[PDB]
Amino acid sequence: IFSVDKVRADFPVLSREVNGLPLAYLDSAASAQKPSQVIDAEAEFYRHGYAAVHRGIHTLSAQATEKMENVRKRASLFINARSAEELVFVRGTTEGIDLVANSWGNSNVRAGDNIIISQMEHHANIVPWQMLCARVGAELRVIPLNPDGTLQLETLPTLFDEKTRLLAITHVSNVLGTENPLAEMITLAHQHGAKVLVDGAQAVMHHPVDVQALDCDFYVFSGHKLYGPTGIGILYVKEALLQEMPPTKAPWRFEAGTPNTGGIIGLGAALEYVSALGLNNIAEYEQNLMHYALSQLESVPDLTLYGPQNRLGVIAFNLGKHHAYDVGSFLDNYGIAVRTGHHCAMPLMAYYNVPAMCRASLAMYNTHEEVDRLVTGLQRIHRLLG
Template structure:
């Protein structure tokens, strides 16, 4: 059993205490964005009311407080993912920007015509499109590790795809469309054996179970604040310091420089080299508050709750007539994608909305996954630490109502 009282946890999230369309809200769309605990809301309000100022440059007291809060958030992130050094924590807008940053700095410097970028078939578009763009810019080749009909990576194909021309492996930790947990540590071991760096899209992982970047061994790890109960517009790129030190800047502007003349620019050290302009100060403060909230619950407890509720929800959904799960990997986290009879997922989502139930329908920014399973879209219920068995039961009742409508 998980080590926290989920009903008590729900009280920390004020948005959940409401009715929509005359029904109690059932929020099952946390893979798109998670709700925010009062602790995060309070941290944002407190920052704006007492500490708001720009960071790093000011000598007045508010700037000093804001800088302390911002850099304190960097240390909080470092601790949460067990990075070696705060210099390995770069604040960005989210996972998407983090991956683009690596593609356009490390990638443009190290990847050329005829080189290869290896990704997987179950990536979010954020871990496909930046690499496709890089390949178009450089003449490199994009290669793909396939998935099988369970939604698991075909590991037998990996060693043959990691060639002497492979310059980076980019892989999701948890598929947002399938819930599949990728064997990131094993993939990193195989890639590093051939001298190939690894980037991990951790957007769907950090909210569900402990992540230790040193244990994983990856070179880069990206995630977003809004998926893990923090604000939107803030995210993190972890990069091993030796990798970041060797990368050119991503954007130019204030604070990413040491000196500027009309003849020469000297760039700042990492991580500031990659944080041009005024950063999302309150976003970093809110992200730190979200991390402290998770740490207070205990990530092992969060992971246990995720496993228990996912098992219950999987069994409950499989009892619904005509429902077919899309993605049945042996190791999953937090996501249930499905087709219901021959009903279009958008219709499923619309009818559930009338019952106060929020799910996601569509291709989930993972169109190659949909193409593999030969479906235009799926219905996706995604779970978080505030969801309960009662939420799942409400979903099942709602799906029976969908079937009644289409009988």
């Protein structure tokens, strides 16, 4: 069983004070805090094993290359890829998606074709497809939202046709916490010969992810949101699709310039740390924390929530008519870190006819007590400003 107090003890930032008050870090969806096992694994590599990694002759370089390829293998097991060679080290989810849009998109999407995204996508899964469509004269189509923050699945027959080359879809919305029915959507897409890229940046820390079971063609996620270092992400490419991506041999073709070995070592340690805790244990604790928060938040007057009741990870909200920026500033003044703004999801904001929302993340190291501070803080803000 999960013990949040033991987990929290691994994270040295969580003891920090902010504005003289104990930090309540509810912004893990923007970036997660890192355990000392991750911090120290990277530091130890720099301290005792550092070298360049291009199968250099000498010992440190050869040992560092092997360390990096062992992390690649561990990442492929983490997402149940068939082969370690299907995994590409990228700088982040943003770059991984862009890499696919140029390497695969440029030679597989032609004039008169269409690409399907959704109205809940992060900008990182919108802009590369907008650019590709303008480059080649294709059409970008958008699955719309329901008020509850789920996709209007009934619109799929009007969007998928013989010229649909790609579906690019978020696994979990970074704003609403909606989890999309990927397996079923992928079956549909493949019936038309379309490939599927999954943006999984908000999925891989909340429960197991199996790309063989999903049968997705591309899958991308971010190291820094998986309790890992910045500057490193993972792009999964189904080995079959390398024949559609013209250029040495794969993974390494897509890793030009010096690898971020520091970040790779830390990412490996983060996968180990998460696996040692167990993703199903994490899921169970976070789901219970989420249910406690949504129940307590019922007692906040004039609170508006956006998204489905079964959200993962994040709670998007606005308080009365107060601007999200001001709600966020008051919460920060209490030592509570939430995120405000458009969350790199302006089409989603436009759908709800707001310019901005507040967002609280509830991660595996957050507590019922921190939820209580958020609830109390929102009540205080409402009294003081209403």
